Design a protein around this ligand. Structure first.
Ligand SMILES: NC(=O)c1ccc[n+]([C@@H]2O[C@H](COP(=O)([O-])OP(=O)(O)OC[C@H]3O[C@@H](n4cnc5c(N)ncnc54)[C@H](O)[C@@H]3O)[C@@H](O)[C@H]2O)c1
Ligand SMILES: NC(=O)c1ccc[n+]([C@@H]2O[C@H](COP(=O)([O-])OP(=O)(O)OC[C@H]3O[C@@H](n4cnc5c(N)ncnc54)[C@H](O)[C@@H]3O)[C@@H](O)[C@H]2O)c1
Ligand SMILES: NC(=O)c1ccc[n+]([C@@H]2O[C@H](COP(=O)([O-])OP(=O)(O)OC[C@H]3O[C@@H](n4cnc5c(N)ncnc54)[C@H](O)[C@@H]3O)[C@@H](O)[C@H]2O)c1
Ligand SMILES: NC(=O)c1ccc[n+]([C@@H]2O[C@H](COP(=O)([O-])OP(=O)(O)OC[C@H]3O[C@@H](n4cnc5c(N)ncnc54)[C@H](O)[C@@H]3O)[C@@H](O)[C@H]2O)c1
Ligand SMILES: C[C@@H](CCC(=O)O)C(=O)O
Ligand SMILES: C[C@@H](CCC(=O)O)C(=O)O
Ligand SMILES: C[C@@H](CCC(=O)O)C(=O)O
Ligand SMILES: C[C@@H](CCC(=O)O)C(=O)O
Ligand SMILES: [Zn+2]
Ligand SMILES: [Zn+2]
Ligand SMILES: [Zn+2]
Ligand SMILES: [Zn+2]
Ligand SMILES: [Zn+2]
Ligand SMILES: [Zn+2]
Ligand SMILES: [Zn+2]
Ligand SMILES: [Zn+2]
Lengths: 346, 345, 346, 346
């Protein structure tokens, strides 16, 4: 089968021919119908040799949707042909976090050698992929696979981040979304669907601010030195109830701290090495909590899929073939994908 | 009346004779029965002239309990003689936070000129004190005033900090308490009363570790460079579900970040200027939230009082006269009060 | 001043001339700009002499909006001319419930002689009204008073009922609204604004089903013996996550029990004497909680006002003069007000 | 192997000799170390032929602890000899409830033919028992099996019931526990461990009231006509914040409604056919919710085990052999087991 793999440290990923895998006991083989590109793949491929720990080669893609092609021995709960999304952040399934579906916060996974697809195990950027267990598949019914693939991370991650503080986001609240890319453009829509928050989007790029308004942002602010003051002018001086920072650069985190309300929240979702919030007296408002959330829970993925099925999420995508996978990663690097890149095999 | 006031920047507070105040409309005059000393008073008196904004003179004391002495015009809901605790962090009463009793997070109070007693308005370190409104009094019934005065901040603040994340602190959880002083020794007891968390106390001083064990800590370990490893050995490598840092120095915040569990919590309660948690990827576990909480809510003060009345809080105090107030502040500075200092007028 | 009062047990309310009140210390005099009619007023006026406890005469109206006309001695926080809504369910202000703004659940109010306007104290169906304390006023800014008056009960009560179980109403959930009148037509809109629940409206009257669809219900079905089966067909056999019953008749409560999901919720909001849910094993699904909520909290009223100001609530009203107040009550009795009746004094 | 089975409708269970089962793929064979008797087994054996649906014969016992004896094909995560408690209310593992560990509220289990051990599948009152999946085992380490077996239902069920409303049970709250048997005597202890609620225990039997005080009840009240007044005298007239009714007879539910506070909670946990709360205006306080909870969640079982391991639960038991199993059921019927009956296979 055809796959896109990271094969050499510091090199672009390549299209390869590798064996179609066979599912062992408990496993499911999917025919991949769509595989999302996430900017985290760029972080992974930019790691120096000393830090990179996912093994080579690595079939990329941790945003996967497919149809069940083959059931491993003992698997029930799915039939051949069933359309499914892959729950990405695999946990041990047994610990207290996993018992609540919070496999994203499993502390046993590392020691047990459990790695996610596209991030230590073979990913979805291939004609076929293996899933370890039935509990990591969520049915999507007749959802368009191209728009469904991003739900598994571009949807799941903002959904989880928002869910952690949803009780704060009542009528009269304001939520700031910083970074209107793959995650952020879905984040805006989740906020509109599950809360009555007023949504202010922030981006460097005017076309991304246009995208923000297209997907339901109430206001759009240019990122940079003026952003904090502009956001404060929009919130009447009180600041924003919650800031969801999908960039996570020091400058955006600083913006977030300068605008968050007393008893509000900053969610640092975007990853920029070294960047951090400074949470201490006189540096942040009283009661304003800060967290770096990770991925999301099993039930949260189901909820994201339910939003999509109800017509609440307009996922902006551009489609690529497997052959175009490396080109798509170059596009993601340069910031020229308006929303989420999605590879559609064959 | 006799009062203890901060009167000159950089100087020790002094015992003064000033007029007994008279309550205006809506106000209540209390005869103070106990006034707690909080280390925040030390922070206030150490502010340089450029930062200090509470006015001079300032009658100290933001931990106050008393008996109703005089009702201002229009006040009902209290009779003369009623024993009451003063809710300290006065808000506007009208905004969305205040409407939920969360006057500690009122953003309108500053612009309206509303300041708390002992921190801009006259405090409880005096024979009498004024309270602005009935909603800032909580009845304490027959609670011993000496043990009650600390409830208003030493109790309230940890109670609020713990309450923010109480749903995390189920059976099998671990809570670390750093700093077993006024706040911390009450924090341990609140954790034991309202959760099934295992409680690990941390302090510099071995006598404070003994205090921690006396008030129900499951383990008590020495603060400093070895504390993170010692705490991890106790938690089996998984770390602590929540860390309540009542010191808030950079070294204790660093300890907190090195021990907090995935999806846990750090509450930076103690105040040390410039100190901060560094909340970013690779610097803290996934899902571990960090906050600097402030004071507590109206209903939280009532709950603290209810814990005290039920016998769940053994408040360790040392009692001082008004005349000894300045000496008590010196004792607080040097760290020689085992628990909370309380002035009794 | 002109007022509408209940003056004789069993008789229609009457238009009267009574003294314009003067505010004592702590009180505020409002010039009433709009006064809502609630079906609870019908329940009150239908009480026999032995049950009726609100005193005669009683100026009706517990849904009040006005402008501050006179400040009593010592009142600050409001200026003359400020547009305000009256928080209805007055409590003691001092107990643990009141300290959280939950004056609706105050247990001390009765013993202290504290009664709400229109329900023991003089109401808003008059040119002027007294409010006991500043904490019972919420600013409405430039909101149209006619559409604002219903927020104080038609908005507040459903808002509170929904808020009690808002965490259940995630994506994929279904909420049933029974009774699309004053409360119900606002309840539908609150559900759409603060949740991603699919909303199924139920009413006896086809025109009310049309109203339900106009204000955003996803489906609207006829009440009665077939309603439970029709709702189950819409929910795929799993039943409804939550049922908000704004009728509260035995037949509607029975419908609610026959459709509620496992681990769901029934909120019995409507008042029909003797009617009750039967909460016991084999009579209701496992984990399905049932409550009779009452009014709402101070912060909830502020949130309702915030929804209205954000354009999320289209309040359907019909306007009456004070002189038409008794006629409006006859209209409410016969069920011919499409939404909420509102008296506008002048 | 020896087992205790219900074999004939209306007859006492019998000691039988049946084949030792062998684990199929995914299954685990446990050597049973302790098997709890629950009064629900009495309800099951009293069902007429027309209602009884669990098949005959049925190996009783849905409170099971054991050691891993044999691993089925594919099972890892447990080693032979590991001490484990069985999570009883088996669900499908895949639905939204199950994804959160809430298999107790699974709606798919019935249609998939999934039944719990002792309640449709073979139970723990045998020398060995099969568990369907690793996710239904929770490690107990060196916990005494006799005191551990009741945790799986006598602990789990009250724990779940309490957990549903734990935020109500702050300092100053009162919780009433009605019925100080298997469940109730553990319920008291959970309340003391996880809340600062004052606990009032209610029972018919003075020896059970003594047991209540032994396990930490603050007060003990004789059940019956005087109980409501006695409880109100203890709560100062305000009533009880929460009532956990482990009897669920009409008289105890009536007591519960007569004592529950405004904005409180009644949890009807005990099963008495036909008995129900009457939740309607004028029949219950405003805001007082009522539910019939069922079993508990996966993570709740882990928490119960954690309480036991921390020394917070003193489980009162009487031990029986397998041969004495039928005698133990007679003892349970007559109400002569002080706490929980536990069979220990030889
Ligand atoms: N925490 C998690 O679990 C998690 C999960 C997935 C992705 N991520 C991270 O989230 C981030 C976003 O991922 P993506 O795939 O959406 O990226 P993307 O490249 O699709 O989007 C980036 C967006 O941010 C904007 N942007 C860049 N710098 C900005 C600034 N200084 N101010 C405002 N806007 C700015 C860009 O214009 C673009 O709209 C990445 O760092 C990724 O690794 C985190
Ligand atoms: N956030 C708020 O709303 C709020 C409210 C009140 C007080 N505070 C702050 O809480 C802090 C504690 O106040 P207090 O009155 O309890 O102080 P205290 O002087 O009574 O107690 C300090 C305790 O901390 C211990 N300690 C000091 N340095 C330590 C270290 N590095 N590691 C471990 N233990 C250490 C001491 O040995 C002592 O037991 C102060 O900074 C105070 O200003 C905050
Ligand atoms: N719990 C509380 O705090 C609270 C507060 C306010 C009002 N209420 C009560 O809520 C109820 C609704 O009040 P309102 O002012 O909205 O009434 P309304 O008369 O404006 O609306 C009643 C609606 O219910 C519909 N209806 C009547 N019987 C029905 C049935 N069997 N099935 C379906 N629909 C039916 C009518 O067609 C109408 O659309 C009243 O009983 C009132 O007393 C309760
Ligand atoms: N909801 C669930 O998921 C669930 C789970 C397990 C058990 N149960 C049910 O819980 C109930 C209790 O089970 P158990 O095994 O603890 O029973 P048990 O026989 O061990 O205890 C019954 C206790 O209730 C007391 N009692 C009986 N009638 C009473 C009355 N009128 N007032 C006060 N006390 C009274 C008895 O004296 C005894 O102390 C049973 O009905 C059982 O079926 C429910
Ligand atoms: C490398 C990065 C992957 C997150 C993601 O799934 O996008 C992470 O593990 O934090
Ligand atoms: C000066 C200090 C006071 C805190 C306290 O009330 O103890 C603060 O405002 O943070
Ligand atoms: C009299 C009635 C008033 C309800 C309402 O405010 O509509 C009640 O209190 O039940
Ligand atoms: C028969 C009974 C079993 C409850 C239990 O597990 O004890 C029920 O299904 O409710
Ligand atoms: Zn990603
Ligand atoms: Zn795990
Ligand atoms: Zn202080
Ligand atoms: Zn305020
Ligand atoms: Zn009404
Ligand atoms: Zn009250
Ligand atoms: Zn049972
Ligand atoms: Zn299920």
């Amino acid at each position: 089968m055809k796959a896109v793999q990271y094969t050499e440290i510091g090199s672009e990923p390549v299209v390869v021919d590798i064996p179609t895998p066979t599912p062992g006991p408990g496993e499911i083989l999917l025919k991949v119908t769509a595989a999302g590109l996430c900017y985290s793949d760029i972080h992974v491929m930019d790691m120096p040799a000393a830090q990179y720990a996912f093994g080579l080669p690595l079939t990329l893609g941790h945003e996967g949707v497919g149809t069940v092609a083959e059931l491993g021995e003992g698997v029930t709960g799915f039939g051949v042909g069933d359309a499914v999304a892959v729950y990405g952040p695999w946990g041990c399934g047994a610990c207290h976090a996993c018992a609540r579906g919070r496999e994203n916060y499993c502390t046993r996974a590392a020691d047990l050698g459990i790695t996610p697809p596209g991030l230590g195990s073979p990913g979805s950027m291939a004609e076929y992929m293996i899933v370890d267990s039935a509990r990591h598949l969520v049915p999507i019914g007749d959802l368009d696979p191209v728009a469904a693939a991003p739900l598994t991370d571009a949807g799941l991650t903002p959904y989880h981040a928002i869910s952690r503080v949803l009780p704060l986001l009542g009528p009269g609240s304001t939520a700031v979304v910083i970074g209107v890319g793959g995650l952020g453009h879905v984040g805006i829509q989740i906020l509109r669907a599950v809360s009555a928050a007023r949504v202010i989007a922030v981006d460097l790029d005017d076309d991304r601010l246009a995208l923000a308004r297209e997907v339901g942002a109430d206001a759009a602010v240019k990122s940079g030195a003026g952003a904090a003051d502009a956001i404060r002018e929009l919130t009447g001086g009180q600041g924003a109830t919650a800031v969801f920072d999908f960039v996570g650069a020091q400058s955006t985190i600083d913006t977030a701290q300068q605008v968050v309300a007393v008893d509000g929240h900053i969610s640092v979702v975007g990853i920029h090495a070294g960047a951090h919030a400074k949470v201490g007296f006189f540096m942040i408002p009283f009661g304003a909590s800060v967290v770096t959330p990770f991925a999301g829970t099993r039930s949260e993925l189901m909820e994201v899929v339910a939003l999509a099925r109800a017509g609440r999420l307009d996922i902006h995508t551009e489609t690529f073939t497997l052959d175009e996978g490396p080109a798509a990663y170059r596009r993601l690097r340069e910031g020229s994908i308006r929303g989420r890149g999605v590879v559609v095999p064959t």
